[PDB]
Amino acid sequence: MSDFNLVGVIRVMPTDPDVNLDELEEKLKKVIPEKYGLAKVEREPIAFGLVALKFYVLGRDEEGYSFDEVAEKFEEVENVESAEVETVSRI
Numbered sequence: 369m370s371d372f373n374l375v376g377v378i379r380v381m382p383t384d385p386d387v388n389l390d391e392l393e394e395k396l397k398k399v400i401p402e403k404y405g406l407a408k409v410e411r412e413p414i415a416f417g418l419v420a421l422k423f424y425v426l427g428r429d430e431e432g433y434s435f436d437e438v439a440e441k442f443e444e445v446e447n448v449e450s451a452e453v454e455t456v457s458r459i
Contacts, residue, residue: 372426376435380451385417387447399441
């Protein structure tokens, strides 16, 4: 087929308000495995001083692709409190 037919949006919550965001994204973007693609990075700041990051990761609906997998790789990065897969959709 050659394209991407799925998108999984992973929400990452930083450990605390003081976390440098630009650096976080840059680190997370390179932790994204080779076969996945990036479609969009969004910031959703919250009232308490923190700002959640939303990654729209591209993949395929075939063995070998696991959005929970990249969420986990995301959780290994420093200053990341947690990474979850909010939803997955066909594209």
